[PDB]
């Protein structure tokens, strides 16, 4: 079993700024990561999978990267649509470890 350290669940940000969210890997999982975004009282929808593989729905704002031990998620801009909770999923090994979720509240 391994432990995943996520970014703080509390966030205060202004429009036009860059938001970085990271969940660190304990070893070389070899970019078997996945991401999701669930709205309040609604199902999640995929945005980026396999670390760096764009999914239809957002042109460029969502773009992850990283391999081996270092992994990061970079967002160029913040928009009203981006809101809710964020999770990162790993499935290299049988016992899955999940994040704590980010209760993002914009202002």
């Amino acid at each position: 079993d391994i432990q995943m350290t996520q970014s703080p669940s509390s966030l205060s940000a202004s429009v036009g700024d860059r938001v970085t969210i990271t969940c660190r890997a304990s070893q070389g999982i070899d970019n078997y990561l996945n991401w999701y975004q669930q709205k309040p009282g609604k199902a999640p929808k995929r945005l980026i999978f396999a670390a760096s593989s764009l999914h239809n729905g957002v042109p460029s704002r969502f773009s992850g990267s990283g391999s081996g031990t270092k992994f990061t998620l970079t967002i160029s801009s913040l928009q009203p649509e981006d809101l809710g909770t964020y999770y990162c999923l790993q499935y290299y090994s049988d016992p899955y470890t999940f994040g704590q979720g980010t209760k993002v509240e914009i202002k």
Partner: peptide, 18 residues
């Protein structure tokens, strides 16, 4: 409880409201 296909490395994935 949510019903959905397991997450994989494919373009297709859907979830139910539950």
């Amino acid at each position: 409880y949510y019903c959905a296909r397991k997450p994989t490395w494919d373009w297709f994935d859907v979830w139910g409201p539950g």
